[model samples]
Target: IPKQVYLRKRQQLFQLGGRGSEPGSFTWPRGLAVGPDNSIVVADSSNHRVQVFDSNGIFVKEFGEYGNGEGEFDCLAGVAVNRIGQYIIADRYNHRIQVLDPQGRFLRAFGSQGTADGKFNYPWGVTTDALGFIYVCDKENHRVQVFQSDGSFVGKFGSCGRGEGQLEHPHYIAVSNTNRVIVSDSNNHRIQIFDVNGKVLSTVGGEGSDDGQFKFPRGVAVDDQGYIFVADSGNNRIQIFNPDGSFLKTFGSWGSGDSEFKGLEGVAIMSNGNILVCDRENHRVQVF
Candidate 1:
């Protein structure tokens, strides 16, 4: 059985964007990151750009277009921010990660379409840890690759399988307390926890719409306390879990209303304690 609605203290604070090409608008927004200065960075996927907003949801600026050029992108996915204000974006269709300055100035790009080390096939998520290690979810390659802040490959782990230490289209990732790596293993319908060195530690969820189950989960975020928030896409909701991979609570549904979401893609926590979610199909980001 599923748990009762446990959103007693949570409510949508505000939302950003609507389906369009206008600035601040979104056409399937995917990942989001809370920048060092508290700016909200969103990968406006189909728009081929990343949108920035102030802490209060006010639009700031946007970057990228529809090309593989320096600051351009083609269907980028997740975005991450390092401690120094750099944005690491997964340029999905381009099969690379682009590092941009806080002002959206392209610094450099790395990786390409391949399975070798330092390579990726449809990189879906990018994250940076406390020690400045960058972790990327190479979706099609069924692995997570680690790198230096400068894009130097360090190591990688996982492979195409259903067992532990294996992955199936892992879509998004996050680092907890800068120690453990949390991944949304989408196709496997579960979340996997791993150490910084890629050792699988715990796994949770399955293919179901119940409280603890997930259907093609896409985005994942871990708070300072190791609480996990997953964007359970297929079920159109977000699920919460404890550090040990146990279910805590569940909220959201499929709709266009206040707290509801469709095609939920990313879940992130704001520094101020607000929960953020990308309501993809609704073309918006809601803060809770």
Candidate 2:
């Protein structure tokens, strides 16, 4: 049998960013990931830039701007750091993925505004596996595209539907240590687990506020022990699940007060096992 799981809201470490267009501030912050150096990289969506913060939530540096140029972004949606510390940002409005070095230098980019292969229709979430395979959640197209480290098309999966092996406006993705691809089927109000080859393994949750049910779940993260943490966005809470998709525990509520969330978006598990949540409408990131 699996070991018992226990998670509690330790404390809200610190809140990062507020409603603004300046450095150290954010407007509609979205996806986020912990870098190789333990730094937190945030997709400051409306600001059209990626912000880097130390593990303590102190601002380090930031890159990109409001444009379509090399290092510029037009509404960044997701920001992920690969095993090698490279930064990958899903340029949502531009319908492409931009790769950058640790220092924020643009290395390469791929995709465009199209429904064809190697193209994207509002890419939302981006992540890279240990093998350097990049997975992008093609939101509007209701599919996920796999690519190589060099931006080469590897394969694709899912389509616009509510059936098994299908998706509807998938928002975020997380790959587990066992190579299982977990996707937040936002519109379907469930989480879909898939093998690396795109075969659906199982589906978790449904539309409800009950223990195991979800309402517009968003970000997902798999811990080393295989525990699944999902941003239960519409419910204004975070839900924990066993590896087999059994609901474990839930936390948070709807409000701007401490431990409360409004329009929650991205979530990431820090190296130390702490949870970081992007309270989008609250304009801050809460750590616990």
Candidate 3:
């Protein structure tokens, strides 16, 4: 089999020229979330907007601009869609989370720059559970805040430390259908698990480049089958693990090639079982 593939091979599906939308516009696209219809929502961070693309990688629509307004996003970094199909985005720099429709229409927004409940300090990651509850990774504050689907503050937990349950630079989060919460404990080079009540259940990975170790781990996702995938950014690979953190398989390598990745940031598992990885530094999403 071929060792790697180039990202440009999928470019034609959403080429910068021709009838499709361009790609060079996104300065630092980071976050990614897939809707039920297979619509790819990208947090075009530096571009100050969220770009929507179809399953085939064709740009269908775009929304949000750099601002603190209702529909605006300031340095968007993460996005998630709940069971009700509500589009939730981590408006990073603005220190809030914005909700919108699949069409990019603003629905509501909550949180602000604070360390108290319902507030955030550099909130970077966002995800929803099967119960419609939202989880926001308050990066700088070293905690994950929870809220109701309608924006009501529920509670928060986590602290900055190197312990098994503590978090350091908690960058991304994922919620399983069973209500298990998994967090990308980035700086500490591990993944932390917690229950719905924020109690630390277990921790996986460590500071290493090995299959079970992660270097600068960033994005994380849990598919329907309960398999967890970690975007080992610095290691330039995607590592898969079972629900209990046992090593399963690994893919990708550091390169601009089609099957390789430079800095894998966000990951999404489609309903069809295909994995979409945001090869961030390469300015493209690799599907496999």
Error of 3 at 22 (Å): 4.0
Give per-residue CA lDDT, model 2, range 1-288, as digits (tens). 223323665357677888998888989999989886678889999989999999999999999999988889998988889988899999999999999998999999899999999999999999888898999999999999999999999999999899998999999999988999999999999999999999999999999999989999998888777888899999999988988899888889999988889998999988677788999998889887
By TM-score, rank the candidates, best first: 2, 1, 3
Which of the two candidates, 2 or 3, achieves a greater lDDT against the reference?
2
Off by over 4 Å in 1: 1-10
Global lDDT scores for all candidate models: 0.88, 0.90, 0.81
Against the hidden reference, what TM-scores do the models get? 0.95, 0.97, 0.91
Q: Write the per-residue lDDT of candidate 3 for residues 1-288, one digit (tens) a residue.
A: 111222212221232211123553555578888886887777778777877777877778778776888898888889998877778999999999988875668889999999889999888879998788999999999999999988899988899899866889999999987788999999999999999899998888899987789998999998875778888998988887876679877777888765777877788777765667777787777676
Task: Give per-candidate clash totals.
Answer: 0, 0, 4
Residue 284, candidate 2: C-alpha displacement in angstroms: 0.6
RMSD of each: 2.9, 1.7, 4.4
Q: Judged by TM-score, which candidate is best?
A: 2
Clashing pairs in 1: none
lDDT of 1 by residue, 146-193 (tens): 999889999998899889989999999999884999989989999989
